[PDB]
């Protein structure tokens, strides 16, 4: 009978397939009925991006930068096949790469633990956080094929040939056809990455591990290991020793293994690509991709981009296309909204907003924890192949709706 | 009371730290006593590589190329810390990066399965086989630091400006200091990697998944996806449909997640860097890094390099250095030997050797399976912290020696 007035505007980026269905239903029954928010809509569906020539993604990202908070829905990243499917103009770049490259920062990811649910990696009991660097490397590289024999070279030409000097490093000499590419990153980005990773370790009282491959990419990865170590000793080694938490660099090999056999409970900082890949493993490993939150934070600490860790769940969308029933977990999507709404509230000092968010969350999880109403993904975790063990994609969302309404009378 | 003559010679590459110590005992107590082998030795310790200016590495690589079979102990790949520890000249490149780059091929790694021993990803019940592309990408890249503002271009100059034309892509425009890198790979190499993969899928009658990140590196990762598919239909899809196995390319993100929640029982052809990182996850997932074999197979199928998949085990070596007890798993190391002897045998039609290999493996595994003698990692796998559950590095090794004697009388 009353609505919470949200101060500043929230930027919303709509997506594709299964996740677009879930999204809408979420803001219809779970968000709009309770909030007086000014949503600045941006449709990032393939058809929208195509028609707009990906320009909209530029606009969306710059909207987020402006207003501070963004809630993004899963989106189809066009690969040859996709182009055929939607008869696209170009084979557009992942909008996630464009946004992330525009905003910068780290993408913090961690599973949503529902006690009632088992775990694929049983020994894991305490949440594992992934601090994926969002800025460069291969999500902003320059790949290209190489026709026939010739020389490959990476060339650098300074602006002021007085403080530095040119470089022409011979990369290879093809004797046949193949591929090549080059990527990059900056000291500025890595430093923010480090600052954001040390802060979260301190804020959550968890040990921090930076994983790299510095024994191979001696200079490249070495810059990561070194800046981290520099910043640490510079202004965290104090609060860390005082908190009982340690920072340590390890080789990615050792770390992913150390993790697979641990009880979870620590922060893993990784380069973009590793943050990307491993986050999925952690996700799937704690239960299902349906139970992992994701949020990009800028070094500022005043800009956010909330999203689910998974994709558009195409495989499930395909079933939905042919009148077949679906059991897609919407929990990450709900949290994508709640966590977005949370940062919105802290930024504007609107505790009414933050409270609602925790209620949204508390009700979403309890519908599983308490009432035992879960989708197929979580059902297979408990060990029940039986169809009568789970509910549909819409049935679940309705149960969350119902329990939310109850938990709002208190 | 008799020795097995080994027709052709075996190239042996000694290495560092705890693995060097294990290595020695293996050959003194398990290989030399039963074989008449012309072992073409090559000490690849850090010191032996430093004084030799890493040339020995080159020599060893080329020796394996010549005599067909090489067996390697784990080596230290120097980084800044190492240069200061052993007071080295240069920060030498990984001798594994150097060997693989010279032999080419695919590195097939899978877990060594010990029934009594549990698994960290219980749902896994059938061996997962990694097919790591051994040739290029970041394991033969070129990186450097960017001092200050300037351009960064990927310059390509073909030899015959008729069949192909130069390229000069603009990678980035630094507005500050950062890092830059560039890597490559050849279509020829990829064809080999693809062929090898498939053949293995058939021989072992298992599904073949190729993972990639083409949505991001459309040209680079795309090539892998394409050449793979081209080869499939070009000469395998026949035998596949016939056997009931299905090849298939998926996004890395997906494959790692599928894998984690699967029951296992498939082959994951991965790109070099991925093959590296995933194989550790997989090995640790099945029990411990110590229970996993790794062997390089050149495109020919007539050149091999057996090795353990793990490193030199510094943390343990450190304990040893100060007169403390050790519990390092030697199974990987021993199989590096056996798998190499076996490979030598299938090439010199020496069924006598192939018999020793299998009995060696047999006894190595039954020491754990039957007699219940194992190292601390396998004890904890079983869930027993109690000191009395495992035995020292040397202790375990002696047990394999003793049981080896027995099982040989038959
Ligand atoms: N950040 C973003 O916007 C991203 C977008 N994408 C895009 O999404 C599309 C599909 O990508 P894909 O490789 O399938 O990755 P997905 O995240 O869509 O993975 C789907 C697979 O994992 C399972 N899964 C994933 N999410 C859920 C969920 N919420 N509930 C239940 N199960 C789930 C599905 O279940 P099951 O095993 O039963 O089939 C299926 O196997 C592509 O266009 C891709 O580019 C991909 C990644 C990130
Ligand atoms: N192919 C090669 O020659 C390789 C060489 N290296 C080199 O090895 C050195 C050490 O690298 P590092 O990061 O420690 O990687 P390691 O392979 O040495 O990993 C050691 C870690 O994993 C565990 N572990 C690994 N192997 C075993 C084993 N056989 N038995 C029991 N436990 C094991 C150890 O257990 P615990 O948790 O108790 O410490 C330790 O945590 C470095 O110089 C690295 O460059 C690295 C990779 C490959
Ligand atoms: O941009 C994309 O295609 C999705 C990348 C991805 O897997 C993720 O952000 O989780
Ligand atoms: O070369 C190195 O440092 C080790 C690389 C590695 O992890 C492997 O060969 O499995
Ligand atoms: Ca991902
Ligand atoms: Ca490895």
Swiss-Prot record, chains A, B:
Activity regulation remarks: The enzyme is subject to end product inhibition by NADPH and 2-oxoglutarate.
Cofactor section: Mg(2+); Mn(2+)
Site (Critical for catalysis) residue list: 139, 213
Disulfide-bond pairs as recorded: none
GO annotation, biological process: glutamate biosynthetic process; glyoxylate cycle; isocitrate metabolic process; NADP metabolic process; tricarboxylic acid cycle
Cofactor: binding comment: Binds 1 Mg(2+) or Mn(2+) ion per subunit.
Protein name: Isocitrate dehydrogenase [NADP], mitochondrial
């Amino acid at each position: 009978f009353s609505k919470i007035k949200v101060k500043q505007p929230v930027v919303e980026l709509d997506g594709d397939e299964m996740t677009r269905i879930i999204w809408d239903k979420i803001k219809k029954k779970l968000i709009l009925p309770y909030l007086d928010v000014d949503l600045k809509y941006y449709d990032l569906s393939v058809e929208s991006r195509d028609a707009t020539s990906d320009k909209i993604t530029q606009d969306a990202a710059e909207a987020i930068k402006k207003y501070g908070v963004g809630i993004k829905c899963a989106t189809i990243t066009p690969d040859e096949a996709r182009v055929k499917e939607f008869n696209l103009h170009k084979m557009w770049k992942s909008p996630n790469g464009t946004i992330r490259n525009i905003l910068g920062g780290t993408v913090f990811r961690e599973p949503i633990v529902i006690p009632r649910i088992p775990r694929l990696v049983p020994r894991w009991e305490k949440p594992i956080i992934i601090g994926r660097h969002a800025h460069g490397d291969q999500y902003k590289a320059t790949d290209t094929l190489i026709p026939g024999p010739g020389s490959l070279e990476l060339v650098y030409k300074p602006s002021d040939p007085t403080t530095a000097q040119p470089q022409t490093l011979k990369v290879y000499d093809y004797k046949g056809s193949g591929v090549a590419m080059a990527m990059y990153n900056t000291d500025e980005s890595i430093e923010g990455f480090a600052h954001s990773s040390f802060k979260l370790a301190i804020d959550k009282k968890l040990n921090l591990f930076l994983s790299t491959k510095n024994t191979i990419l001696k200079k490249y990865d070495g810059r990561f290991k070194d800046i981290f170590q520099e910043v640490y000793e510079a202004q965290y080694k104090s609060k860390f020793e005082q908190l009982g938490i340690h920072y340590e660099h390890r080789l990615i090999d050792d770390m992913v293994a150390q993790m697979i056999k641990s009880k979870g409970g620590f922060i893993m900082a990784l380069k973009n690509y590793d943050g990307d890949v491993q986050s999925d493993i952690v996700a799937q490993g704690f239960g299902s991709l349906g139970l992992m939150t994701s949020i990009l934070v800028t070094p500022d600490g005043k800009t956010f981009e909330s999203e689910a860790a998974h994709g558009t769940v195409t495989r499930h969308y395909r079933k939905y296309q042919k009148g077949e029933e679906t059991s897609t977990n919407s929990i990450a999507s709900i949290f994508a909204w709640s966590r977005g709404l949370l940062k919105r509230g802290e930024l504007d000092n609107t505790p009414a907003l933050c409270k609602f968010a925790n209620i949204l969350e508390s009700a979403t999880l309890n519908t599983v924890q308490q009432d035992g109403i879960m989708t197929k993904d979580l059902a297979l975790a408990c060990g029940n192949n039986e169809r009568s063990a789970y509910v549909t994609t819409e049935e679940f969302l309705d149960a969350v709706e119902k329990r939310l309404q109850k938990e709002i009378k208190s």
